[PDB]
Amino acid sequence: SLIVTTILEEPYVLFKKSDKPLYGNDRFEGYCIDLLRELSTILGFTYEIRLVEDGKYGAQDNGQWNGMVRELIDHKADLAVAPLAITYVREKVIDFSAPFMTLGISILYRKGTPIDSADDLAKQTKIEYGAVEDGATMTFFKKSKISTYDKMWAFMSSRRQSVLVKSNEEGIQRVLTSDYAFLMESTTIEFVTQRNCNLTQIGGLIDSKGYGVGTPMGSPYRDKITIAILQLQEEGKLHMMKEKWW
Amino acid sequence: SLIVTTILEEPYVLFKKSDKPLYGNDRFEGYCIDLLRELSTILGFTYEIRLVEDGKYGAQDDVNGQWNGMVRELIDHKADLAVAPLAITYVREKVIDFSAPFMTLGISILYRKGTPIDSADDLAKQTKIEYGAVEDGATMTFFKKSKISTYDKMWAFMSSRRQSVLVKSNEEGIQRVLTSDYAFLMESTTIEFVTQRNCNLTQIGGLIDSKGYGVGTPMGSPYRDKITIAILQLQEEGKLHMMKEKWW
Ligand SMILES: C=C(C)[C@H]1CN[C@H](C(=O)O)[C@H]1CC(=O)O
Ligand SMILES: C=C(C)[C@H]1CN[C@H](C(=O)O)[C@H]1CC(=O)O
């Protein structure tokens, strides 16, 4: 039996709503749960789903790793199945399957302003902007030497206290209730904009990355999961699953 | 010193044009060459570029189970890396390893502008307009393996007309499109290069699937995750994007 570490994030993983109380794996549904189930069928493993205790994805603080990334490092889990960005920093410490979805950083804002691009935000200060603290998105800006993104980070880091948030939900509410643009992942933006008609992605994608299944470094499951993902992708299951949940 | 297998394909890999004949790695330029050089700098390896002898990418001979092309080179440890527009596929992954993708693309349709043909389904449900792909390439293999109804049907068509509608290069496919009533199934990245250069050609519909190109290594090779890590760095600092801009 595999321990599968995950995190609450709609529509990837959520508590299934029902009257009768649900137990163990039944409690969960979502794109990632469907994925996990499809993988389980192809590969022939059983599993226990567990929500990462510290509720973090995985960042380096003292140099300590946290979240689902730490769980894999310490062998406290076999797989991480969540919207976990495949990144340089994470890849040095864990392994990732080939990506099951592709995405990019982009901007969440209200409809019908003059704001048209990242550069439009960067060259002003009236409209505040930020991102989830210590997430892949934030780290991209923190490390970027592209001139526009450098400026944005200078803005964000200096207003760290007030513009950086602890979740996508927190960021979304900010956008809805104040003059604020949220830097978030395009896949999540798409879900949100379908459900709030007054909101909209601004500009295009700022970068490119994927979500992958995480495994402890050197794990034999890696390429097995990779092969499974490619199979699923080519036969259009991954696509149906996106269509289902979006 | 690493042995790097590759193949001539614009704008990924090409012979540098010059009066004086050039030697070794100097002979080559392109997106993939730039990539290889950037990887070499990050990882600190030296290398020798070699064009794959049989001039194939990699399919399994379905009579005798022999692999060919760059995939075969890696399997046999005749090379350390394959750097080319080598699609990361289910069948190939079972026999070699791939880095994380340096480019994302998908199968699409190259056709002439301003017909009623709008999708793969439109092609599949007729026979007047012929269609095909590079023989034994990733695109053909996708249709050959697909259980999607429309694609299954397309493969029935193609395989039975194997004689005449499957081609040996992108270039051959393109000439076909230009000079007869034919739609060419090819990779979207290549479509884009081509359409920028022939003003009467266009992409029909959207992407039929999604895949990446990755650097190939022999299974269990340690180079894998090193190269992957290098690719993620290059992707995150926007160098991969600049490189595409440069060559397109
Ligand atoms: C905090 C969110 C939910 C996570 C999700 N994926 C990204 C990650 O892998 O860290 C983060 C998005 C972001 O940083 O904007
Ligand atoms: C025969 C072309 C040039 C190659 C290139 N990449 C794909 C591959 O990795 O096989 C093939 C495209 C295709 O099959 O349409």
Numbering used by the authors:
A (entry chain A): 432 to 492, 495 to 544, 555, 566, 667 to 799
B (entry chain B): 432 to 544, 555, 566, 667 to 799
What are the paper's exact sentences on this?
Desensitization of these ‘non-NMDA’ receptors involves rearrangement of a dimer formed by neighbouring ligand-binding domains (LBDs). The LBD is a clam-shell structure comprising an ‘upper’ (D1) and ‘lower’ (D2) lobe, with ligands bound between the two lobes, and the LBD dimer is formed by contacts across D1 lobes.
For K531A:Glu and K531A:KA complexes, there were interface shifts of 5.1° and 6.8° compared with their WT counterparts. Comparing the KA complexes, R775A:KA was again indistinguishable from WT:KA, but movement in D2 was seen in both K531A:KA (4.0°) and K531A-T779G:KA (4.1°). The real outlier, however, is K531A, for which the direction of this shift is reversed. Given the reversed efficacy seen in K531A, both this movement and the K544 Cα–Cα distance show a better correlation with efficacy than does cleft closure. Notably, the K544 Cα atoms are further apart in K531A:KA than in K531A:Glu, whereas in all other cases, separation was greater in the Glu complexes.
